[PDB]
Swiss-Prot record:
Expressing tissues: Ubiquitously expressed. Similar expression throughout the central nervous system (whole brain, amygdala, caudate nucleus, cerebellum, cerebral cortex, frontal lobe, hippocampus, medulla oblongata, occipital lobe, putamen, substantia nigra, temporal lobe, thalamus, nucleus accumbens and spinal cord) and increased expression in testis and thymus.
Protein task: DNA repair enzyme that can remove a variety of covalent adducts from DNA through hydrolysis of a 3'-phosphodiester bond, giving rise to DNA with a free 3' phosphate. Catalyzes the hydrolysis of dead-end complexes between DNA and the topoisomerase I active site tyrosine residue. Hydrolyzes 3'-phosphoglycolates on protruding 3' ends on DNA double-strand breaks due to DNA damage by radiation and free radicals. Acts on blunt-ended double-strand DNA breaks and on single-stranded DNA.
Lineage of the organism: Eukaryota, Metazoa, Chordata, Craniata, Vertebrata
Protein name, per record: Tyrosyl-DNA phosphodiesterase 1
Alphabetized UniProt keyword annotations: Cytoplasm, Disease variant, DNA damage, DNA repair, Exonuclease, Hydrolase, Neurodegeneration, Nuclease, Nucleus, Phosphoprotein, Repeat
Gene, per the UniProt record: TDP1
EC number(s) per entry: 3.1.4.-
Residue sites binding substrate per the record: K104, K329
Main location: nucleus
Residues of the full protein shown: 162 to 607 of 608
Provenance organism: Homo sapiens
Amino acid sequence: NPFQFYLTRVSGVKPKYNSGALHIKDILSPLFGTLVSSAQFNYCFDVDWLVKQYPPEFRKKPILLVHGDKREAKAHLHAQAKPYENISLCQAKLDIAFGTHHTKMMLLLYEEGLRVVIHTSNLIHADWHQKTQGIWLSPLYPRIADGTHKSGESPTHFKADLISYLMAYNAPSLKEWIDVIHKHDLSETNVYLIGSTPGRFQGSQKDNWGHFRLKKLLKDHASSMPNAESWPVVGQFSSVGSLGADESKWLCSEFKESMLTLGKESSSVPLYLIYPSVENVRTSLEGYPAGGSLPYSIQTAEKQNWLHSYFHKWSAETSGRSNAMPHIKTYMRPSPDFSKIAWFLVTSANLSKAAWGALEKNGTQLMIRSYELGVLFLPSAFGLDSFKVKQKFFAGSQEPMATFPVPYDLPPELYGSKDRPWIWNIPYVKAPDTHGNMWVP
């Protein structure tokens, strides 16, 4: 299939729902390539666990961990890695307050070429065990021969855009990876990179990152259709930032405005937000502890009760994952009957200004606090005008190159009047979870 979009394996679902899913041990297997070295960009690391996911024959190859931890957290990560002489660390600079290094990416250098993996899971056992997580696997990119001058660039500009993302760190260990990427041919890549890096972007730079980057790609590489105003926007995420006292402050002004862009020309567009309810979490495979990875605080939520009228339950019968709580984040533009989509984005970015950017200085500057990274699937990059939605995620549909695997059910289902968004720091003592426990933070 052309999309190379996968879910992680879920322990406890029937095998038909894991056939075609990937565990981290599969990604790092010798079948994917003969590993020389690797870089693991992430937020949270269990180093003992991570080294054990590499094949035994590859466990002494150099590994670079790219993280954003400071102070005692930084010391803790260094102490985790100290037993492993082959592990180096790169601390990503976070010079704006309340930012984090959230990007989840593997750079895998092999004897045979290079691969890039952009995904949504932390490098801890629980993120790969019973959660819904998303992975994009690049092609095996071959080396460009010594002495040959060619760009190695794709029609989506992925090579230059990945180098641009790594340049933003201003880090010597990542300049080494930039030089690796320069030496490989990434021309087969059919996705667009959408990154966030921390900073204040004006002028020539405003469209490089965050939601203005999305807007620019949709302006330039998508077409508007008649009745575009009836094509909804769907956003699906595992954490919610402080969005302001009403929808006009950010969500339905600048964020929705970027998401509804199509084509170059100059709003009643429905907006569906998918976020687990308390009942989704209680009845999940993990039970209430799944909610330790859904970090919405009561202090934030009680400032924006207007937001919850946009919320829809998690449901994923299409992939057998209704009880596997989502840590994937996705954004997409379905048709009014949800049978087609104009584009699909899988990313680390949750529904927050820190991740997507907030306009400042009278709309001339986009300020971003965090590192995030995702890949955008546009029909034009596949010779198509729209994607047909795959009816069953792991099924064999008659036109796989035209048929996009959406991992959750459409249309999304609105919360009922008794439902509440999962809020992780209040107790739930009315009904026990699948393991027989309550939640008492």
